[PDB]
């Protein structure tokens, strides 16, 4: 299918957008985000509508759509 574009918002209000397929495991997004922030992945928690995103959550499981937001907080 098509990529959807998600906005990942940091604690400092910075944004990195990610294109993922509906079947992508979101661990891949978490890894890339942590890499680009220069911090360990396990130091961060990733929330969708306030709910914790699991490594093996997919956008399809979470009901995500184009331009949905992920928030990142410290673990």
């Amino acid at each position: 299918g098509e990529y959807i574009k998600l906005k990942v918002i940091g604690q400092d209000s910075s944004e990195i957008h990610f294109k993922v397929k509906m079947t992508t495991h979101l661990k891949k997004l978490k890894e890339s985000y942590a890499q680009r922030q220069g911090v360990p992945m396990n130091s961060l928690r990733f929330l969708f509508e306030g709910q914790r995103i699991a490594d093996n959550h997919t956008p399809k499981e979470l009901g995500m759509e184009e331009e949905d937001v992920i928030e990142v907080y410290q673990e």
């Binding site: 990529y3 574009k5 910075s14 944004e15 990195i16 957008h17 990610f18 294109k19 993922v20 397929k21 992508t24 891949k28 997004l29 890339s32 680009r36």
Partner: peptide, 15 residues
């Protein structure tokens, strides 16, 4: 800040 969009995408082995 500029926009940032990241795309999340054996027999040859020698080790």
């Amino acid at each position: 800040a500029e926009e940032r969009v990241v795309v999340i995408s054996n027999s040859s082995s020698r080790y």
